[PDB]
Design an enzyme around this catalytic site. Structure first.
Site, mmCIF file in Angstrom:
data_model
loop_
_atom_site.group_PDB
_atom_site.id
_atom_site.type_symbol
_atom_site.label_atom_id
_atom_site.label_comp_id
_atom_site.label_asym_id
_atom_site.label_seq_id
_atom_site.Cartn_x
_atom_site.Cartn_y
_atom_site.Cartn_z
ATOM 1 N N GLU A 120 10.858 21.610 37.126
ATOM 2 C CA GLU A 120 11.476 20.975 35.969
ATOM 3 C C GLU A 120 11.727 19.484 36.128
ATOM 4 O OE1 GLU A 120 12.164 22.911 33.280
ATOM 5 O OE2 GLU A 120 12.717 24.931 34.015
ATOM 6 N N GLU A 155 15.625 14.330 30.184
ATOM 7 C CA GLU A 155 14.444 14.536 29.371
ATOM 8 C C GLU A 155 13.975 13.192 28.840
ATOM 9 O OE1 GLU A 155 14.821 17.606 26.496
ATOM 10 O OE2 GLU A 155 12.874 17.197 25.544
#
Length: 232
Positions: free
Chosen positions: A56, A78
């Protein structure tokens, strides 16, 4: 747990935000993490958690120094931050002016996850979601919260890896046999397991096998979640 030199071997090219001391401090909020079972079980749990974290947050490329699995823990936030990641809720209301895009080692996302995670940690993450990208102890604690918390019908990833989850007959019928594959299914199986494009699950397995090799443990059985239906 895991020593500083081994953390620095697993995460040789990480973003220095993610300090060893911060990881150790966070792990003390969940004292059973990596301390449950015999030595092989402890090593596999640690390798499994770090494999997902690395998938991730990876900044790797195919010719990178130390290989394409040596660049975990590069990302914090993100990158695509235009959507608010808000689904209206009376239990976990979206704070005016805040966004719930992915942050930290397992990319905690959405008001409906920041809410309960913060409540469990004693932190107002619902109203201050940027805390997760500010403080590496909080960042690691959000990832461990996910790993350690059951969300019925799903067990915790911790319980799966440590022998404290026994599948029901429906789980077995669906191919959900304890191992690394079931943890992928819990984390993102709707997109990554069953008949999903298996590229992402395969990458998670690549990290897991590398970390198992470095820690000196067999990866165990049931690594692949393509043979497996997402939890209902």
């Amino acid at each position: 747990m895991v020593s500083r030199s081994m953390f620095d071997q697993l995460f040789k090219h990480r973003n220095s935000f993610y300090t060893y001391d911060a990881f150790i401090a966070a792990a003390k909020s969940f004292p059973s993490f990596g301390t449950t079972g015999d030595t092989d079980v402890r090593k596999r749990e640690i390798a499994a958690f770090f494999a997902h974290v690395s998938h991730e947050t990876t900044g790797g490329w195919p010719t990178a120094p130390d290989g394409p699995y040596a660049w975990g823990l590069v990302y914090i936030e993100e990158i695509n931050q235009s959507n608010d990641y808000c689904d209206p809720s009376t239990q976990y209301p979206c704070a005016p002016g805040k966004q719930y895009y992915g942050r930290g080692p397992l990319q905690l996302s959405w008001n409906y996850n920041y809410g309960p995670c913060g409540d469990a940690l004693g932190l107002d993450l619902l109203n201050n979601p940027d805390l997760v990208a500010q403080d590496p102890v909080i960042a690691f604690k959000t990832a461990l919260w996910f790993w350690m918390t059951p969300q019925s019908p799903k067990p915790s990833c911790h319980d799966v890896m440590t022998g404290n989850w026994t599948p029901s007959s429906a789980d077995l019928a669906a191919g959900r046999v304890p191992g690394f594959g079931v943890t992928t299914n819990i984390i993102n199986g709707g997109l990554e397991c069953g008949k999903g494009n298996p590229a992402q699950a395969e990458n998670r397995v690549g990290f897991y096998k590398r970390f198992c090799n470095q820690l000196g443990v067999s990866p165990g059985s049931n690594l692949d979640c393509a043979n497996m239906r997402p939890f209902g």
